[PDB]
Structure 1
Amino acid sequence: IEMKKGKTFLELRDESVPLPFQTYEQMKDYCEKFKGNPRELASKVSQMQSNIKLPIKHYEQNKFRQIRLPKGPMAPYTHKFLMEEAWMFTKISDPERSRAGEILIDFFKKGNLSAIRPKDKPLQGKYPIHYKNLWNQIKAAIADRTMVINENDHSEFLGGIGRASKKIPEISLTQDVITTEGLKQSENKLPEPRSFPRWFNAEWMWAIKDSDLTGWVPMAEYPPADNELEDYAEHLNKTMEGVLQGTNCAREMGKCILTVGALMTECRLFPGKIKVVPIYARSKERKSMQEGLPVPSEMDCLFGICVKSKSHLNKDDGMYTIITFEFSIREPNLEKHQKYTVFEAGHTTVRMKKGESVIGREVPLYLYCRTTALSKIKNDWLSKARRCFITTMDTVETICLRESAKAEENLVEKTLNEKQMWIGKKNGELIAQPLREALRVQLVQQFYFCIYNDSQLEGFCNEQKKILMALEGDKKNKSSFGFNPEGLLEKIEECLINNPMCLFMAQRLNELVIEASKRGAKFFK
């Protein structure tokens, strides 16, 4: 028994070999009899070490430097939906009509949508007429009880603005044709660099606040318990959920979830067709106007509408297109809102408590129009936004066990209610809050990571780790040493373009090293 040999294989084997050897047999004999001569090897490694100039820095004599950010216009809003400038009409939830096609029709019946009649001239936009005619067609379709749109003139345009052209077979090609058409290799465009955003902090703060309504995110049930471990775990999970669910970030999470759950089905059952889809969410409880305590109130909310183009999700890496018509009661700013076309759609009403009664105060109303694309992978990634809770949970438990182990006793409530964590600076002075209040910041960080996820963010997060470890070593009086910091600075500066999250994180990281310079000796000013 043996591996019966061919011919071509043997020829290759005798061919593909090291330089001095031209046959497998010579190389084999040299190998099977290779002996050790550590002296020549030592001389060789010393020669290599001599002809190499390996620098070794200690971060103390040659410290780091502040990062040089790009320069130019501010980075605009990028996410698909609106977080802080949003607005929503409300109504009671019927379990017999708990579907988008039904919720939208019901919202439309009372005739509050039909009153939305944007005027011709916008404030800032590009193709207002298309958006306006499309809005009229949407209302018409909803009136017809079918979410479909037959005519394909505007959608076709707005979907083809990205790319649309003819195609000539290579076989039908000559040199004279080329010289006539001036054909060339399609130049590839690069993302333009942008400046630091001056609105991220506001959105973060707004998200930290507590919403009036609560129960945006649905969750599963809690199985039985059989010992103290599962009881403690259940207690901790319930506490954290009760703390977060009443946050404005949860609202956006639930909205994304319920809208993607419908888009992923529309791109599946009505591909190649134009459909209409709402941007809605469902609540389960509020806070009394006379008392700051929770109260059961199941309700539905509609922030806007999202139209769908032809989507097959099997070609062009499954890229498809949509169009958003969102509601707002806050006039825009030119920088943050660049991709948005805006209108003024009549007025609306606001409701607030008045003693033992409710009143209504009319305000204007705006309509935010925008176009954007998506894919199947982005859908699978957004639908799984509940995982953000898992990440936040880990951070909490990390803090709530380590301490509990140092003292050897349950310190969960004590640390949650007492342990102070720096969150920011006010009036040139630090700000601290309990862990129970910093959970919100952690969750918002994870969420924003989930939204602006991209290669740039991957590089930023993979690189900042080294700076963090170097800083930690500095704290504990350890002579951190490196090889080429400036190269790392360049690696990090090259991945900073048209992604506000990375820019904000870089600025805050510079601020961090600045503040730590008061206690560290590895950073410039």
Structure 2
Amino acid sequence: RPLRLPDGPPCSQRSKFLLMDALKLSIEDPGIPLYDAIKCMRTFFGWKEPNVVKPHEKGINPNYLLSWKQVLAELQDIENEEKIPRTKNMKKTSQLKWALGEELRSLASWIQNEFNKACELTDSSWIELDEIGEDAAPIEHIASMRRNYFTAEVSHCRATEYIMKGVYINTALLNASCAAMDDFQLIPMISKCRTKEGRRKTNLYGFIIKGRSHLRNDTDVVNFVSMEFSLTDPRLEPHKWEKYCVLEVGDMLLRSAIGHVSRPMFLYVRTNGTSKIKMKWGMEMRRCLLQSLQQIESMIEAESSVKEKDMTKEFFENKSPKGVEEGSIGKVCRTLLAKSVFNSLYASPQLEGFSAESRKLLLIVQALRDNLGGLYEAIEECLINDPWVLLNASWFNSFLTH
């Protein structure tokens, strides 16, 4: 019996920042977030008077518009002051006070598309060669080989960009939460990468503005407004953007498969919140790299025990198994990594419940397949509205039909 997935309106985006829909303004950098952000802004000349093109149905849309216009205005002030300050504390306007706070859903196709996008390779590297690991001593020879092979396959992976993006914004927000407790601080969303030719690049995805943050404990919430560039027209999948007000803010000139084209640039705005403990996990997202490697190392040490010989080279160079189901060893590494990253990006008690209880039903059907309710209500009580959980339930059902 397949799990019954819930009927209802399509599920909507709930990550802390854009994933496949993000857009970067970038520079080849010659280290202070706000200076880097302003230089990134200055690379774009297609800005225009912003307007709402997908309203937030439950929020105050004029306040989101006023908030983006305030960002541009206060950045314009910074540009007129002789020095550029290290940080920028927003005026406590009424639109920002409002925005900072002072049901069954069915599976939609977008979340699978997000996951496919996370597995892809980008044209830039997002981690250094020795990024993975915490070891006090030098690693032994086999451990080194395995980490180098693995890193070669995931260093350019889109899921790794999400890791580093996530690490940056969580560190910046958490640091601001105790260094500027009473300020509506403007926090640029930045990542850094290296192009195939070795050039260092600094990327701006947008900004967040934090609310008051007297975080007395791990579960105290700090609210924030995120404002994120995108080329995704929200009118194509409106259900995805239930939680957002979306602005059109510019026009960008692009190289494409039909030469130069001009496409509108959007700004995805929502209010959100996070806690000390979730920001600490966000700072730890590089462990996804380490957890994924360790799942690969289990597979290598299984083939190795059987062959009475270390199988690291034969595993990563694909030289007994007669193929790779996902098509390449590279795709297996990036698939494992994307699962770990999405578990972190989309963490929830629904995911936790689903993971524990679906594994129980897994082993039971495995033992029935090899040798021939209640647990179902436990799993299916986690199938409410979360895109990541619903997708994983959809995947589990394929593992059942097969």
User: Contact 2:40–2:203 at 8 Å: present in 1 too?
Assistant: no
Taking a change above 3 Å as real, the CA distance of residues 111 and 352 of structure 1, as seen in their structure-2 partners, is closer
Q: For residue 396 of structure 1, what is the aligned residue in structure 2? A: 296
Q: Which runs of structure 2 are paired with 1:87-236 in the superposition (5 Å)?
A: 87-94=23-30, 98-109=31-42, 112=45, 115-119=47-51, 121-126=52-57, 127-145=60-78, 147-160=88-101, 192-216=103-127, 219-220=130-131, 230-236=140-146
Aligned to 2:382: 495
For 1:476, what is the secondary structure of its paired residue?
Answer: helix
CA RMSD for the aligned pairs? 2.5
> Of the two, which has the highest radius of gyration?
1
Matched to 1:241, the amino acid is: T
Partner of 2:281: 381
Question: Contact 2:253 / 2:261 at 8 angstroms: preserved in 1?
Answer: yes
Tell me, in whole angstroms, the C-alpha distance in 1 between the residues paired with 2:288 and 2:374.
33
How far has the Cα of 1:75 moved from its partner?
0.9
Q: What is the distance in 1 between the residues matched to 2:306 and 2:222?
A: 54
Q: Greater RCO between the two (CA within 8 Å, min separation 6)? A: 2
Per-residue CA deviations over 1:391-439 (Å, capped at 9, x if unaligned) read: 11111111112212212123222233335343xxxxxxxxx42333211
* Shift in Å, 1:116: 4.4
**How many equivalent pairs are there?**
386
Deviations 1:165-219 (A, max 9, x none): xxxxxxxxxxxxxxxxxxxxxxxxxxx1111122122112222221012235685
Q: Which residue of 1 aligns with 2:353?
A: 459
Q: Secondary structure at the match of 1:255?
A: helix
- Is the 8 Å Cα contact of residues 244 and 269 (structure 2) preserved in structure 1? yes
Q: Could you tell me whether the CA contact under 8 Å between 1:215 and 1:285 is conserved in 2?
A: no
Q: Which residue of 2 aligns with 1:366?
A: 266
Aligned to 2:81: none
Matched residue SS, 1:456: helix
- The 1:68–1:217 alpha-carbon spacing in structure 2 relative to 1, beyond 3 Å, is farther
Residue matched to 1:78: 14
* Offset at residue 285 of structure 1 (A): 2.7
TM-score, normalized by length of structure 2?
0.89
Matched position secondary structure for 2:89? coil
Residue 353 of structure 1 deviates from its aligned partner by 10
Shift of 1:274: 0.7
In the alignment, is the contact (CA less than 8 A) between 2:126 and 2:164 conserved in 1? Answer: no
CA contact 2:219–2:277 (8 Å) conserved in 1: no
Structure 1-normalised TM-score? 0.69
> For residues 203-240 of structure 1, what are the alpha-carbon distances to aligned partners after superposition, in whole Å with 9 as ceiling and x for unaligned?
122222210122356854998998xx712211110111
Q: How far apart, CA to CA, are the structure 2 residues paired with 1:116 and 1:261?
A: 32
Contact map agreement 2:26 2:203 (CA 8 A) in 1: yes
Cα gap change, 1:247/1:491 in structure 2, threshold over 3 Å: closer, same or farther? Answer: same
Change (3 A) 1:345 1:467: same
Runs of 5+ consecutive residues of structure 2 not aligned to the other structure: 79-84
Instruction: Give per-residue Cα distances to partners, 1:274-301, cap 9 Å, x unaligned.
Output: 1101111101232xxxxxxxx2110111
Q: Is the 8 A contact 1:122 1:128 kept in 2?
A: no
Quick check: 2:129–2:148 contact (8 Å CA) kept in 1?
no
Please say if residues 25 and 44 of structure 2, whose CA atoms lie closer than 8 Å, have aligned partners that are also in contact.
no
Cα deviation code 1:344-401 (max 9, x no counterpart): 22301224799xxxx8543221111111111111100111001111111111111112
Q: Contact 2:186–2:209 (CA<8 Å) still a contact in 1?
A: yes
| 3-state SS, counterpart of residue 508 of structure 1 | helix
Residue identity opposite 2:105 in structure 1: R
1:115-173 deviation digits (Å, cap 9, x = unpaired) = 34313x4233242211121112112222222511123311211233xxx7xxxxxxxxx
- Which runs of 5 or more residues in structure 1 are unaligned? 1-64, 165-191, 287-294, 423-431, 479-485, 516-525
Q: State the partner residue of 1:336.
A: 240
